[PDB]
Amino acid sequence: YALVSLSFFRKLRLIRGETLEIGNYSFYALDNQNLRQLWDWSKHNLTITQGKLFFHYNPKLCLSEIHKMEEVSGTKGRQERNDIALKTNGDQASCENELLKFSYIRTSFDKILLRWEPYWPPDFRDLLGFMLFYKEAPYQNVVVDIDPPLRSNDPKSQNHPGWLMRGLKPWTQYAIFVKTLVTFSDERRTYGAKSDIIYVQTDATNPSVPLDPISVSNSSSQIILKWKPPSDPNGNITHYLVFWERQAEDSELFELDYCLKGLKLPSRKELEESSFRKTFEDYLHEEHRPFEKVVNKESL
Amino acid sequence: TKGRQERNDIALKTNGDQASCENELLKFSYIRTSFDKILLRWEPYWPPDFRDLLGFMLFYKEAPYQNV
Amino acid sequence: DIQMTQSPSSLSASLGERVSLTCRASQDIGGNLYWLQQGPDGTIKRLIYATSSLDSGVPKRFSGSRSGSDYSLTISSLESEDFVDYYCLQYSSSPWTFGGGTKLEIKRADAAPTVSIFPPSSEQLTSGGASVVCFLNNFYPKDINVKVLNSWTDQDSKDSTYSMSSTLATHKTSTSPIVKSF
Amino acid sequence: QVQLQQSGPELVKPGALVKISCKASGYTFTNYDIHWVKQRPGQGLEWIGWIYPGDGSTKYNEKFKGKATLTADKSSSTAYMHLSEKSAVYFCAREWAYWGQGTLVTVSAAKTTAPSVYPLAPSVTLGCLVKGYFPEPVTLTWNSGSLSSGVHTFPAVLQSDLYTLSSSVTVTCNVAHPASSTKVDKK
Amino acid sequence: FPNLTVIRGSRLFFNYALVIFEMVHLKELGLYNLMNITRGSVRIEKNNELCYLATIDWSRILDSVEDNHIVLNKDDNEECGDICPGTNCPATQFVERCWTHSHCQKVCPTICKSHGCTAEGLCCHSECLGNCSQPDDPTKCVACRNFYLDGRCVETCPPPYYHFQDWRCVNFSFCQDLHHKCKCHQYVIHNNKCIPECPSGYTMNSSNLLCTPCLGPCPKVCHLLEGEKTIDSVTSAQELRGCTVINGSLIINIRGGNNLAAELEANLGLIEEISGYLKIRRS
Ligand SMILES: *[C@@H]1O[C@H](CO[C@@H]2O[C@@H](C)[C@@H](O)[C@@H](O)[C@@H]2O)[C@@H](O[C@@H]2O[C@H](CO)[C@@H](O[C@@H]3O[C@H](CO[C@H]4O[C@H](CO)[C@@H](O)[C@H](O)[C@@H]4O[C@@H]4O[C@H](CO)[C@@H](O)[C@H](O)[C@H]4NC(C)=O)[C@@H](O)[C@H](O)[C@@H]3O)[C@H](O)[C@H]2NC(C)=O)[C@H](O)[C@H]1NC(C)=O
Ligand SMILES: *[C@@H]1O[C@H](CO)[C@@H](O[C@@H]2O[C@H](CO)[C@@H](O[C@@H]3O[C@H](CO)[C@@H](O)[C@H](O)[C@@H]3O)[C@H](O)[C@H]2NC(C)=O)[C@H](O)[C@H]1NC(C)=O
Ligand SMILES: *[C@@H]1O[C@H](CO[C@@H]2O[C@@H](C)[C@@H](O)[C@@H](O)[C@@H]2O)[C@@H](O[C@@H]2O[C@H](CO)[C@@H](O)[C@H](O)[C@H]2NC(C)=O)[C@H](O)[C@H]1NC(C)=O
Ligand SMILES: *[C@@H]1O[C@H](CO[C@@H]2O[C@@H](C)[C@@H](O)[C@@H](O)[C@@H]2O)[C@@H](O[C@@H]2O[C@H](CO)[C@@H](O)[C@H](O)[C@H]2NC(C)=O)[C@H](O)[C@H]1NC(C)=O
Ligand SMILES: *[C@@H]1O[C@H](CO[C@@H]2O[C@@H](C)[C@@H](O)[C@@H](O)[C@@H]2O)[C@@H](O)[C@H](O)[C@H]1NC(C)=O
Ligand SMILES: *[C@@H]1O[C@H](CO)[C@@H](O)[C@H](O)[C@H]1NC(C)=O
Ligand SMILES: *[C@@H]1O[C@H](CO)[C@@H](O)[C@H](O)[C@H]1NC(C)=O
Ligand SMILES: *[C@@H]1O[C@H](CO)[C@@H](O)[C@H](O)[C@H]1NC(C)=O
Fold first, then answer.
1. Are residues D91 and D155 in the same domain?
2. CATH class of this structure's domain E108-219
3. SS3 state of residue E152
4. Which of E38, E21, E29, E37 lies closest to E2 in space, CA to CA?
5. Based on the structure, what is the number of domains in chain D?
6. Which of A280, C179, D52, D153 sits between 20 and 30 A of D116, alpha carbons compared?
7. Contacts of A265 in chain E (CB under 8 A)
């Protein structure tokens, strides 16, 4: 039940079949509810010396994958009547053979708007809709139900189904792809179309506030300012911008008589608090002073 | 809702396709206890094309209450 | 920004000719390319989306492809209506950018201009000004030197020639220039 | 029928600001991006920016940051562009699939001026010179439109803030300038 | 807020009745009329110019200062020359108490308790809180210790009035108007209070607005926002806990969760009716 692929068998290249399962089977797959892949037949070679294949009750496994295995393994003419079930393999699967292409792509820092080719199966009634998948994907080493568009006419109408992605982190790469949800009809089924995986990177925007800043003076002239980076940089940080400004002395200090006996001059539950700091974090969405643009550093 | 459904409202080929819709009854012909073991026998089932019988499947769990 | 380098700038072809235009992208656009057609009216029509997908009612003679960073619009067999301007447009990233454009011209037999010079009208002279006009009519190709304001016609819908007016001629067809004075 | 109907042509005084409209039809205005493009006469297309009418959300090309402002009126299903030079055509497009007709924006300080029409004659080629008018256009025919063969009417060219146009015929010049209600006939 | 005298703290911000946070430019509080914080604590944090904090004796304003959180202000890194009007103010180290250079903290005789006093030190009436315009007169209070009714501070709301928002007395008609303005919260009567909703185990006796106990589970109609709700977790299902009627449509899209089947039955087991449709998708 737990397996979606047999690819974990990374180096398996031979099954000899010197011993076989009853009915002379060297490879037998029965009642694997989530199995979608055997091996990636574009990369993996597997040889089966003797014996047949048995496949029953693999609802997510396309018959094409099984037929590819027969081709790869050299088992092609070995299977007899009902060794591989036609009705219990792939019956519940995405065996999209056709290609949907994106007609339109638009970024916002928080949003992605997409359009894509309209798909219409033979009996268009059989189109249940579209399905858009997106995940945050930092490396390109890689759910929404979209109602079917407005059918009846086809002259000059952008019946391009689309979707506005709204959640999204800014300056973030998204793996995205669309699929057609259809009806396994009473005849030679229509498998439909899926788009390929496209990556889309949201726009950046203004960075979060620099965190935990500390101001110290080891010297009579030096100030050592240190800080941690914004909790939400929303982009590749270029620099930090520090301004300093000398504060004038307390006006009133020049007009107090300090010989007047009052000469004290200045010698110049945890998860309720956690959520508190976090509340304002979440609430947080000409003249010239001496400044400095701090590059590739978190101190000044 | 009996007369309401039209053509392909309920799929014939994508509902129950992977299920146990056992309609017939197997009966236990024999039961034997040991402190550590249970031996059972039960009626033989043979479908029309007997070739179609993949086998049997026995399920057992520890059940203190018979509310299973 | 992604620069779309579109070639050729101009292309002379004949009815029935297969021709192609190319757009080379600065950066990977992953097939997010459109082809636009702009007519003499100034009206823009999108022909192709997603590199090769043809828009509705866009004649089947138009097609698109890619090989590497080079994207092409191919017209299998030119019809008169096709001799317009074309631009590609990438939609991979943030600032949508276009190609420089390509203008389709009808290739014709070369033709020397009919040069006519006209002295200022008596009415203009009464008014105080004097404009001398020289017409360079019905020549091909379009490239011509005259030796001030110039105004050139677009390609003639009937004979595929060009014409020019210079107000106050060296052409491929002559070894030495066509001289007209009064 | 998805349609984008544009404004203009807008004749504006130099330094004045102008607002152009793009009226949408045949679809839910709210749910699709409206893009704007600039095209200088004889040049190529340039992207200005876009607006999502439903959200009022906008995005500009750096080179148009202050020069253009995009707005939309959901209640009227119209998109607008307010601008801040010389002639330029401005296009409106619904996610690049459907384009507006384009609005011609001409920047000129000039007042209406009627043309001076001159007959020219010193097969045979004759000419007609139409000098120093504003604004465009002029309607020129020969023998009241009877003579159409062998005619070449040259595009108007702007000279010291006034237009000049010429025409030839190879074998009477009739010139009309709407703006000044001028109609001339020169043999 | 020169005259703000009482912060009752009926509802708090994480246990705080007063929150002053990241107020860049704030030099002083200056709430010189603030006499009492009835419930909750004070959180004054990260105000880099903020002074006149050490000069406030919060024990005169709150019963418990133990839960106050006053840190990372200019005051902490003693650059504050907090100088009070008598460089005259009452002192409570024994230090003078003020809000600004021009305003003292008001301190009454201990016999006055929380009631306040006039300038001459005469106690406000025992039903006053913090201050009054005239001594020993419950119609001259700036604020009430208990409840407010008909220009007077009262100990409790007498029948036929109801306690509202834990500070004022209101008549039946007022509570009725609130209830019908909803037809949000449709206000009810319970334990001599006009309240937003019936407590657990009670239901609205429609007519007289009175909460009466429910025989078995309480009926509860849940009207869904934009007529649909998608339940995709135990957390979202909890949002429907106690519902007996759904006015709208449910979409069930549950791909996992601990303790489910039992958790779903706890939260959705009382639903008897759904007015729209029921969709089970990718569950
Ligand atoms: C599972 O596989 C086995 C083996 O499959 C064979 O080997 C593989 C590697 C491939 O080459 C296969 O194409 C090939 O079939 C199958 O077993 C085979 O079954 C067939 C059909 O029943 C037999 O052929 C027929 O044989 C009879 C005569 O009967 C044989 O078996 C009797 C068993 O009691 C003996 O009494 C007989 O004397 C006779 O014995 C055979 O003698 C020859 C030498 O003379 C030996 O090489 C054989 O090995 C031997 N048989 C045995 C069992 O030892 C004949 O009248 C009729 O015309 C056919 O020829 C195959 O002989 C038999 N082979 C083996 C090795 O068992 C299974 O049927 C497969 N099961 C399924 C469900 O597919
Ligand atoms: C601020 O004003 C109030 C006015 O009454 C002063 O008294 C405090 O009043 C609150 C109620 O308003 C009392 O709290 C209650 O305590 C009981 C338990 O004793 C509890 O059951 C209730 O739920 C509620 O919490 C509080 O006891 C009472 N305290 C005193 C000392 O009288 C309050 O003292 C004033 N403070 C200052 C510093 O002026
Ligand atoms: C005060 O500190 C500065 C900065 O110190 C640097 O950063 C510290 C966190 C630590 O890593 C130090 O070792 C670093 O030096 C001192 O200024 C620098 O000092 C070095 C010699 O140690 C010198 O080569 C640099 O040029 C100095 N930089 C500048 C801008 O002057 C400074 O000397 C310290 N003074 C005292 C009194 O402690
Ligand atoms: C029941 O109460 C209403 C409303 O009371 C008003 O609002 C309270 C919160 C409080 O401020 C009261 O003192 C207010 O009177 C009464 O309606 C008011 O009646 C007066 C005359 O007595 C009139 O001047 C107001 O305009 C009315 N205000 C409103 C909002 O209606 C109503 O009379 C009371 N009924 C009974 C039987 O006592
Ligand atoms: C796939 O594998 C086939 C069989 O492999 C050969 O036999 C096995 C038992 C090993 O000894 C192995 O090393 C041998 O190569 C090949 O015949 C076939 O060509 C292979 N195809 C590809 C594309 O590699
Ligand atoms: C993608 O590549 C990175 C290394 O560049 C690696 O850390 C990560 O695990 C990879 N993920 C997959 C699914 O291959
Ligand atoms: C079976 O009954 C017992 C009470 O006798 C109860 O504790 C247990 O949870 C029940 N189990 C089921 C599955 O009903
Ligand atoms: C109390 O209220 C009066 C109202 O006139 C005001 O003048 C006075 O300043 C306040 N009293 C105290 C003690 O703050």
1. no
2. mainly beta
3. strand
4. E29
5. 2
6. C179
7. 81
Q: How far apart are CA A9 and CA C130, in angstroms?
A: 93
- Cα A95 to Cα A116, C134, C139, C177, D35: the distances in Å are 19, 71, 61, 71, 37
**CB–CB of D118 and C121 under 8 A?**
yes
- Find the Cα–Cα–Cα–Cα dihedral D60, D62, D68, D71, rounded to 10°: 10
Alpha-carbon distance of C83 to C104, in angstroms, equals 5
Indicate whether D100 and D116 sit together in one domain.
no
Task: Clarify whether residues D103 and D123 are in a common domain.
Answer: no
Amino acid at C115: V
Alpha-carbon distances, residue E59 vs E43, E71, E92, E97 (angstroms): 15, 17, 10, 12
Q: In what order do the strands lie in the sheet with E41-45?
A: E16-21, E41-45, E69-71
Out of D72, D95, D110, pick the residue that ends a domain: D110
Q: How many CB atoms lie within 10 A of CB D113?
A: 17
Q: Does residue D57 sit in the same domain as residue D92? A: yes
Please identify, by atom number, the ligand 1 atom nearest to the C-alpha of residue A23.
Answer: 73
| CATH value of A1-96 in 3.20.20.30, 3.80.20.20, 2.60.40.1180, 1.10.10.10 | 3.80.20.20
Q: Tell me the C-alpha distance between D57 and D50, whole Å.
A: 8
Give distance in angstroms: CA of E123 to centre of ligand 2.
18
Is D79 in the same domain as D121?
no
Q: Identify the bridge partners of residue A146 per DSSP, sorted by sequence position.
A: A130
The domains located in chain C, with CATH, are 1-108 (2.60.40.10), 109-182 (2.60.40.10)
* Domain that includes residue D173, residue range: 111-187
Give me the torsion for CA of C126, C132, C133, C136, rounded to 10°: 160
Tell whether D91 and D7 lie within a shared domain: yes
User: Nearest residue on chain E to A284, judged by CA atoms?
Assistant: E22
Q: Are strands A291-295 and A239-243 parallel, antiparallel or unpaired?
A: antiparallel
For ligand 5, atom 4, the nearest C-alpha belongs to: A47
Please return the burial class of A91, using the count of CB atoms within 10 Å of its CB with bins 0-12, 13-18 and 19+. Answer: buried
Is there an atom of ligand 3 within 6 Å of A224 CB?
yes
Amino acid in position D108: S
Tokens found for residue E212 = 């009466």
